Amino acid sequence: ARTVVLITGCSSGIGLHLAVRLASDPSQSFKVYATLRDLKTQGRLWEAARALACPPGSLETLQLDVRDSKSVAAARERVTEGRVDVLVCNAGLGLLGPLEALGEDAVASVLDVNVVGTVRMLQAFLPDMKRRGSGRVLVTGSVGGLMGLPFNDVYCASKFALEGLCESLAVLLLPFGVHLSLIECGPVHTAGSPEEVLDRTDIHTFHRFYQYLAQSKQVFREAAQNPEEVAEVFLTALRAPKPTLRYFTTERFLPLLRMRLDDPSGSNYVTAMHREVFG
Amino acid sequence: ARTVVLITGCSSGIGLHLAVRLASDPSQSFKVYATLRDLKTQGRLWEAARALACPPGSLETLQLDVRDSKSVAAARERVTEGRVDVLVCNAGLGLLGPLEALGEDAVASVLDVNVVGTVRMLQAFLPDMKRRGSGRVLVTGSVGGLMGLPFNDVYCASKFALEGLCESLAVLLLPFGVHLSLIECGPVHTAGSPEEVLDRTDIHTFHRFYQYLAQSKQVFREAAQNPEEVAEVFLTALRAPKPTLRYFTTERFLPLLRMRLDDPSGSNYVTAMHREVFG
Ligand SMILES: C[C@]12CC[C@@H]3c4ccc(O)cc4CC[C@H]3[C@@H]1CC[C@@H]2O
Ligand SMILES: C[C@]12CC[C@@H]3c4ccc(O)cc4CC[C@H]3[C@@H]1CC[C@@H]2O
């Protein structure tokens, strides 16, 4: 059909739910280009697709390695309909642990994909949307991209980066009638070694790691959302006459987010979050 | 003397002012390791140093390429006093223009240095400060790291990244008695081609570029601060019994920063800043 969509990172989590959520819309108004990094993972996508009976030729597989400029280029050209009416920037990675234990090569990887990779999609897909004078860009945000979480230093870094990349472009894009919004997600219902962590860290840091790993499992269980609810914000947003900049899947997180805003110097939030995690 | 300091990026701007501001303190309590990327730029540093008569052996030159792990390693070892009582993470780069015109290789460069490079310093210097149970980390922040500025997409991205890297580490570091604060700077009094920009962009984007280049020159002239005032926040902060997370060199920027906090969805700030720059 019509709305030509190109989603990134669809081999699990939200991206996958998303493609199928759209591919199979009752109105049959979306064509979908679910992009996988590693093609030999199209399995799940297709299974779930077959389960909802998405009409044939409404979902398509494309491989796309965001850490590489040519792939982004190639992917762009396979969009036969010749436009990408809605672009959903979703590839993202994560990283847990005491900074000192994280390997350089890992940190590099996390920003290349999360940050740089996002920009590369934007580069290739912005122009024609400026050209045509219309289109929609959707970026998967997170609560970690609005406030720092102990032991997630680099993921948060990488999640704030997109917050800044997307708020700047907002201002400029305004008059072009090209839209960009971020979907502020939280825990969604989606699934290092102590020898190695401990090896590379001071035991007191390690005691706190453990302590934190213990606190998030709790938080997950009670705050975590049904993937089908997270994906529904996406469509709520790609259907607003004039969408906002941020869409928040949950509101649970607004209170800590507010008291972070009242005291810019930070000692309030740093303190509340500190005990909120430890004691 | 005593407080062993290691500043990064001291060949101009704030870092340079900083080293000399400290090297030459009347109390003679700081030893300084001004780090240059490119050593054949030690000139200015030394000139200004000679001008304030910093006592000999209170300032030292070290070369340090933040995009490289060994250099950081080597630099660490030349700190003969065997400790880095205060670490001032200051190397940073910038980037102006419509995203679509920015070359990949440039974007990579901006995050490797600003973000990754910061982390690499932290990696090497965090541990022993955790070990000793004391020390101070100072990071040069910016107003662009708290709100997006049109045409500065990637710099802002890269400046929010450190905001998130530093707020996360804050929480964890709390009990170790190791301190970390960011110096939220703005315009400080420190000094692409239209063929090429225009080549790679739609003329309407270009008209807006120009328009913006025109608005910031104005803003600079009236908001810009004497470098000696910016550097004085640094020492105000490395002397607080228990410092806060953020130190703001100016307050001019708080009003826009506040109305950004009241409406999380963003349409308020995006809008105000939009006209604030264009019309
Ligand atoms: C950021 C997440 C939501 C917020 C979570 C939170 C929220 C509050 C809190 O006190 C602790 C944590 C720990 C784990 C966090 C999560 C890990 C990933 C998820 O997106
Ligand atoms: C972010 C800076 C301070 C805030 C400035 C500003 C602040 C307000 C505004 O309406 C426009 C601009 C444009 C240039 C900006 C500056 C460029 C670098 C400087 O640090």
Task: Report the CATH number that the domain containing residue B71 is assigned in CATH.
Answer: 3.40.50.720
- Of A265, A159, A268, residue with least CA distance to B141: A265
CA angle, residues A30, A34, A40, in degrees to nearest 5: 150
A270 and B164 in contact by Cβ < 8 A? Answer: no
Tokens of A271: 């303190």
Residue type, A211: Q
Whether the CB-CB separation of B10 and B16 falls below 8 Å is answered with yes
A154 and B119 in contact by Cβ < 8 A? Answer: yes
Radius of gyration of chain A (CA): 19
Residue type, A132: R
Q: What is the DSSP letter of A116?
A: I
Q: Could you give the number of structural domains in chain B? A: 1
A21 interface with B at CB cutoff 8 Å: no
Q: What is the resolution of this structure in A?
A: 2.7
Breaks (C-N over 2.5 A) in chain B follow: 191
Q: Detail the DSSP E strand segments found in chain A.
A: 3-8, 30-36, 59-63, 86-89, 135-142, 178-185, 246-248
Whether the CB-CB separation of B15 and B59 falls below 8 Å is answered with no
Helix (H) and strand (E) counts for chain B? 11, 7
Task: Find tokens 């020390």 and name the residue.
Answer: B135
Looking at the CA of B190, name the nearest ligand: 2
Experimental method: X-ray
What is the helix, strand, coil percentage profile of chain A, to 5? 55, 15, 30
Measured distance CA(A216)–CA(B106) in Å, rounded: 37
Tokens of A1: 């059909």
Q: Is the CB of B144 under 6 A from ligand 2?
A: yes
Measured distance CA(A269)–CA(B83) in Å, rounded: 30
Measured distance CA(A83)–CA(A76) in Å, rounded: 9
Distances (CA, A) of B113 to A37, A45, B64, B120, B274: 27, 38, 11, 10, 29
Nearby residues of A217 by Cβ (< 8 Å), 6 or more positions away: none
H or E element, residue A208: helix A203-223
Q: What is the layout of strands, in order, in the sheet containing A178-185?
A: A59-63, A30-36, A3-8, A86-89, A135-142, A178-185, A246-248
Nearby residues of B186 by Cβ (< 8 Å), 6 or more positions away: B142, B143, B223, B224, B225, B249, B250, B252, B253
The β-bridge relationship of strands A178-185 and B135-142 is: unpaired
- What chain B residue is nearest to A106 in terms of C-alpha separation? B116
Looking at the CA of B96, name the nearest ligand: 2
> For chain B, what's the residue count?
279
- What chain B residue is nearest to A148 in terms of C-alpha separation? B168
Q: What is the DSSP letter of A38?
A: S
Size of interface A-B (CB pairs under 8 A): 208
Nearby residues of B279 by Cβ (< 8 Å), 6 or more positions away: none
Neighbours of B232 (CB within 10 A): 15
Residue-wise DSSP of A134-181: -EEEEEEEEGGGTS--TT-HHHHHHHHHHHHHHHHHHHHHGGGTEEEE
Specify the 3-state DSSP secondary structure of B75: helix
Active site residues of A: 155
Q: What is the DSSP letter of A242?
A: S
Of A157, A244, A270, the CB nearest to B245: A270
List all residues of chain B from 175 to 204 with a beta carbon under 8 Å from chain A.
Answer: 176, 202, 204
B113 interface with A at CB cutoff 8 Å: no
Of A100, A162, A261, the CB nearest to B127: A100
Residue B127: give the domain boundaries: 1-279
Taking CB atoms and an 8 Å cutoff, what residues of chain B touch A162?
157
The β-bridge relationship of strands A59-63 and A178-185 is: unpaired
Q: Is the CB of A141 under 6 A from ligand 1?
A: no
